[PDB]
A paper describes a structure:
HsEAAT2 forms a homotrimer, with each protomer consisting of eight TMs (TM1–8) and two helical hairpins (HP1 and HP2), which can be divided into transport and scaffold domains. This model is operated by the rigid elevator-like movement of the transport domain to translocate substrates across the membrane.
The root mean square deviation value with the substrate-free state is 0.399 Å, indicating that the structures are very similar. [name] is composed of two moieties: L-asparagine (LA) and 4-(2-bromo-4,5-difluorophenoxy) phenyl (BDP) moieties. The mutation analysis demonstrated that the inhibitory effect of [name] is largely diminished when Leu467 is substituted with the corresponding residues of EAAT1 and EAAT3 (isoleucine). When the BDP moiety is captured by the cavities, the moiety is likely to sterically interfere with the movements of the HP2b helix, indicating that [name] indirectly prevents the HP2 loop gating of EAATs. In summary, the LA and BDP moieties of [name] play distinct roles in the [name] inhibition, by competing with the glutamate binding and sterically preventing the HP2 loop gating, respectively.
Residue numbers in the entry:
A (entry chain A), B (entry chain A), C (entry chain A): 44 to 109, 114 to 147, 163 to 193, 230 to 500
């Protein structure tokens, strides 16, 4: 993509400009603030779209776009995505690629799933505080999970209204279409905004090597998880359900997996993977035709794991320990954000800010992730496809009732 | 109703489980927090629906569903309901069944009726503070009266637009339908959530007998008010307008009043009370046919008085003295909440939380009211019907212009 | 207008009642609070409409009502209006008719143009704070510019959807129609509310003469700016673009300029000014017919300058120095508020409260401006027309491509 080319030029232009300035001389903090500042505007403009995206997206999906295969598929996609998100979380916490009550954390999480007030859910979340007399208190930070939960119920209830709700469905489609023209417009300013964030990050850092390590270990963590998720869990889950040889199964899809690494798009890989399951594995076109193109938008195991790893890496870098509820929010938002980084065009960065905002994390560090994203995007696209493929397998085998 | 059977099983299951635990041994506060916790989820899920109910409900009612008899009826219903709400307030403050600046309180109330900002009205209300230099300051708590006032004006203005506003009417019907499917879904979780609140209330209390007294005196206060409201004020207002014998009037409707106590529903009592006024009193079918079925949704004198008593009883129990504005908010929200506990199905508990939230009261004590509600519901249903009946009377007499 | 007659009776009735009380004896502060109080209700009821007006207005305008002449006109109107707003600001700060970090002020402004959160933009704005460790912190005050920017993008994006967005256009027309029936209803209570504000202002003031001076100097500042804007800048911009004799140009429109001063309405002046440019200047009906009636709603150079002067005069009176960003907010809100004081009927006062709220200024001083507004309204209506007229000129000359 031009935007993909522009964003990487952008990273370079900003990396080089960042060193030139860093090696040039100490940059007065008000001059770094300014070099960064257009990049802060980019984060502000994306964060501004999170709320209207969540509401538009949820309502349009759960109503507008709602058999046995369907449940089989949907149950598969969601299970695998949460597995990848949790694996992400487990792995990032174990390897810990970053260097700078428990019950309450869980009850605050459950509390925040049911916000007393929707406008207040939009910009504030509940917390427990110790006075040893405990109290609930508000804290700044959009209650994302609470809002999502409300809008899932809202959105399912609207489906259960059928055409009686068609005017409300239509209203929220238009809102989605608009809000998506804006996430596209803003993403055109993204290369310059990324440039400025990076340029501003290099100049601030005390020791490039510490950050090169930390970011390197961040890349090893994502590839570990994609390897575990792609190479063990998904095949293992196929064998456990199909009692079939997964090594046989891979043999068929290898054309697709090659295609995924090269294309870095599951949409471009789509016609290849139809062939690989229809011809080589011999999966019934019906089970394919449903599951492959649906899976190419909602199943993104690999994008789930990346987002979970990335979120805690940013947390860890900014010397934040996540409480048990934060780490559960990360798993649930990583899952959803995955589903929507794939469903919403050029929402990759929006969905990262969703995750960071949900856990109340400093957002400017997203710059280093944008920097290494281009290498990782081909590898997670591979795990993303392989998942969809195994699904075709697990659905067809579980669909011999027919 | 199954829900009515389930909620009372729920109260029992929780009362017994509450004693078993209370008599078992001292329960560590973090274990009571947990026993209660599913019940806090119920309050959170209902409070979350208050805002979308008020907006949906107001707009759908004042526009969608808007002669001489009509004004006669509507002026009667509203007057009697405010009388019952104030009687409630007077009675509860006099008998005071609970044991743990004035101008400013009124101006803060009037201020809060006109909120400077609607989003801020949704989660915050104005207050006067003494520094002797007075200031306005925000306080946490949804400005319910302000929001309602805005949405009455909004909703009347939309009616005065006619079909020019039909798309906005339709949009807010669908929203109402949805928001009502959710208040139904949540009310199915209500028995378990009530169980857990009660279970959690018994275990916390130091002296069961003090609370049995206080709750008992709460029941005597409601029956006093239903007696005064049903037995004196309504007949007196009939005689004052009709110069007719009220004791004669009761003679006719006694079949209905019996039916009300047994049925505990004004909807089931409805065909009986048509008969009693058409046949026995000989009220013109026209004046009946309008006033009886409309009154069976919006006239609930007895549900108004109960809600006013209940609100201040919770206030009093939680060692809160209500300022003159709080007590006026209670009368106005008790009035509205009455009208909507009757108009919105399974909204009884929602409408209680509306009243408690409007006055910023601890909500968990709603449990004891849910506990004694089943005895009181047959008695207030009686006063509720008798009111509608007298109305048929007062409208027919005031409608001899014809 | 009756409202115009009533508001001036109102000012008098309140001026006289204010003196009577002021000369009567010292009025206990709680009795002044009360004399003022109905006027505070008026400010509250208008401020409550700002948000739904901005959203309704922006969406209905930028979508519903969106050639070369059109760009020529629109580029002219907007340029001249910002010139008048800045002239307003320059003049009021120089003459300074009122008696009781820089970069950060600009970055806070730019930050506030891109609000991280829309609900939070609705009632809160970002600020820099010094700890010399700088931080961002929220402050109470609706982020008007941020909200407007979001709703311009939103509104343009919806236009670029065409009829695909017709249901969302229709929805936001109805909302506009409603919100405008309310700004009309409230403006009928305005004379009494103005009366009470004034009555309350006289009684509080220590020295009438200081305030008569300050308000007098406020009137000299507006007339200076209308003279500079009307008499120098607009003709100069005509000569610079048309190389034509402006003194000739005025000769034609003098019938209109007379009509403007007398009528105090650009709508009543409208048929006159068609004649003056079609007959005397000989401007092509086409260029007139587009530009004159459009300009009679959106070009209000003179109303822009007044609002800018008025805003800083209120700031200055309330011993507030505006930071560089505040003064830029004033110029941008003064521009917009101009456009909408003209487009929205009886929104003059709403649009003043928009400007004061945008800069977080005490609003009750709007009373003195309402008091002197009647003299100034004929003079700014004159500059308002002259601007539209010169535009017809500058568009026709720049439209000889044809
Ligand atoms: C020294 C430090 C300097 C810092 C400078 C920071 C950048 C400030 C400017 C940001 C900016 O203009 O954003 C560019 C970005 C991208 O613009 P772009 O031109 O790079 O790419 C998109 C191009 N179009 C629109 C043709 C598809 O603007 C947007 O996409 C904004 C969308 C959100 C709009 C709502 C909030 C902001 C509203 C502002 C006013 C309207 C802007 C236009 C909206 C879109 C079209 C309708
Ligand atoms: C130890 C302490 C443990 C505390 C446990 C507290 C309870 C936590 C779970 C609460 C719960 O599930 O609520 C049950 C209740 C009632 O469920 P129920 O199954 O008891 O009764 C309703 C049944 N249906 C839906 C078939 C009619 O759920 C709702 O009704 C929720 C409605 C509001 C939804 C918006 C906010 C919450 C969103 C959460 C995710 C979606 C839930 C489904 C929504 C409805 C269907 C679309
Ligand atoms: C001693 C100190 C005393 C202070 C008293 C302050 C004034 C308090 C009362 C304010 C008031 O009534 O406002 C008058 C004003 C003006 O009323 P008016 O009668 O002067 O002029 C308008 C007349 N109509 C409506 C026929 C065109 O009311 C409004 O216009 C209110 C519009 C906004 C409504 C939303 C917020 C307020 C809701 C309150 C309840 C409904 C009111 C009616 C709404 C309009 C019709 C649907
Ligand atoms: C015959 O075939 C039928 C098939 C059925 C499709 O069903 C839909 C079910 C809901 C689902 C999974 C769909 C699309 C977008 C999905 C959303 C993207 C958003 O992303 C998020 C997170 C990130 C935010 C920035 C935006 O919102 C979520 C809240 C939102 C989301 C995950 C909620 C659920 C949505 C598809 C049709 O498929 C085309
Ligand atoms: C020919 O017959 C005509 C007749 C006319 C009916 O007119 C309507 C007038 C408005 C009215 C009284 C009606 C129904 C719901 C009523 C609402 C319930 C809600 O309850 C509340 C409080 C509690 C909240 C939880 C929800 O909102 C109020 C704000 C809301 C409410 C009290 C606002 C006023 C509404 C009926 C038709 O009758 C079927
Ligand atoms: C063939 O002729 C075509 C012509 C085209 C008209 O185009 C429209 C373009 C948008 C524009 C300029 C129009 C009307 C209201 C204008 C709004 C008034 C509001 O005022 C504000 C500020 C004050 C607030 C209280 C309300 O909102 C702004 C945000 C809002 C505003 C300035 C946004 C822009 C709007 C006209 C038709 O003309 C009839
Ligand atoms: C401050 C901003 C506006 C200037 C930055 C310059 C670069 C990075 C940006 C700004 C706007 C961008 C353009 C906006 C939209 C499109 C349309 C699309 O079909 C192809 C790319 C293209 C043509 C973009 C190319 C890159 C671009 C020129
Ligand atoms: C015998 C074939 C073996 C060697 C194949 C079967 C499946 C394969 C894996 C499938 C998917 C991925 C994810 C990718 O990002 C890195 C390589 C990795 C982890 C592959 C490595 C090789 C592999 C384990
Ligand atoms: C935690 C929750 C889900 C479990 C609690 C168990 C009990 C109290 C609840 C949970 C869901 C409830 C069911 C949900 C909805 C309906 C449909 C209605 O037509 C009859 C009652 C019925 C069938 C309910 C009976 C009681 C029920 C089984
Ligand atoms: C002669 C008939 C007398 C005794 C009748 C006429 C109306 C009756 C009242 C009507 C309604 C109620 C409300 C109910 O909740 C308790 C009894 C009470 C208060 C009744 C008591 C008996 C009563 C006073
Ligand atoms: C507290 C308020 C209601 C009382 C104040 C009295 C005066 C100032 C106000 C209140 C309501 C106003 C009326 C409301 C609306 C209209 C309709 C319009 O076509 C002509 C003017 C007219 C008829 C107004 C005249 C002035 C008026 C009588
Ligand atoms: C030769 C004609 C001269 C004297 C004319 C041409 C344009 C005229 C100006 C046009 C508009 C205005 C604005 C009005 O509010 C005050 C007078 C003022 C400033 C006029 C004063 C006289 C003027 C300067
Ligand atoms: N290619 C896959 C789908 C895929 O990976 N989607 C995706 C794409 C971009 C993206 O953007 C990010 C995320 C960050 F966290 C970050 F810091 C920077 C950027 Br830029 C996030 C997710 C397939 O099609 O299978
Ligand atoms: N039956 C009448 C109408 C009637 O009484 N409606 C009604 C029903 C349930 C209800 O629920 C509550 C309220 C509480 F305050 C509480 F604590 C617990 C519960 Br549960 C409130 C009002 C008729 O039809 O005439
Ligand atoms: N007449 C012009 C248009 C015109 O001036 N519009 C306008 C009208 C009223 C108005 O009202 C205010 C403003 C204040 F700041 C104030 F304090 C009090 C009041 Br009241 C503001 C702007 C034309 O038609 O050309």
């Amino acid at each position: 993509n031009l935007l993909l080319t522009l964003t990487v030029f952008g990273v370079i232009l900003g990396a080089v400009c960042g060193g030139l300035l860093r090696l040039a001389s100490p940059i007065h903090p008000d001059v770094v603030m300014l070099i960064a500042f257009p990049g802060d505007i980019l984060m502000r403009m994306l964060k501004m779209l999170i709320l209207p995206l969540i509401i538009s997206s949820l309502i349009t999906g759960l109503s507008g776009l709602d058999g046995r295969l369907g449940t089989r598929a949907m149950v598969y996609y969601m299970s695998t995505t949460i597995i990848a998100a949790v694996l992400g979380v487990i792995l990032v916490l174990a390897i810990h690629p970053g260097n700078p009550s428990s019950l309450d954390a869980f009850l605050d999480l459950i509390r925040n799933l049911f916000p007393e007030n929707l406008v207040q859910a939009c910009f504030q979340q509940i917390q427990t505080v110790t006075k040893i007399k405990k109290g609930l208190e508000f804290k700044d930070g959009m209650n994302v999970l609470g809002l999502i939960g409300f809008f899932i119920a809202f959105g399912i209830a609207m489906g259960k209204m059928g055409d009686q709700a068609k005017l409300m469905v239509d209203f929220f489609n238009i809102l989605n279409e608009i809000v998506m023209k804006l996430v596209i417009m803003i993403m055109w300013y993204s290369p310059l905004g990324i440039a400025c964030l990076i340029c501003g990050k290099i100049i601030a850092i005390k020791d490039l090597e510490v950050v090169a390590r930390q970011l390197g270990m961040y890349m090893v963590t994502v590839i570990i998880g994609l390897i575990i998720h792609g190479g063990i869990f998904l095949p293992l889950i196929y064998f456990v359900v199909t009692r079939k040889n997964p090594f046989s199964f891979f043999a068929g899809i290898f054309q697709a997996w090659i295609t995924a690494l090269g294309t870095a798009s599951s949409a471009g890989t789509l016609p290849v993977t139809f062939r690989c399951l229809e011809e080589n594995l011999g999966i019934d076109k019906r089970v394919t035709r449903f599951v492959l193109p649906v899976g190419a938008t909602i199943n993104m195991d690999g994008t789930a794991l990346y987002e979970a790893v990335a979120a805690i890496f940013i947390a860890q870098m900014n010397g934040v320990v996540l409480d048990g509820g934060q780490i559960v929010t990360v798993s649930l938002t990583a899952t959803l954000a995955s589903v929507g980084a794939a469903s919403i065009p050029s929402a990759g960065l929006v969905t990262m800010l969703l995750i960071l905002t949900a856990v109340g994390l400093p957002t400017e560090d997203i710059s280093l992730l944008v920097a290494v994203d281009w290498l990782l995007d081909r590898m997670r696209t591979s795990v993303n496809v392989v998942g969809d493929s195994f699904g075709a397998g697990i659905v067809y085998h579980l669909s011999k009732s027919e």
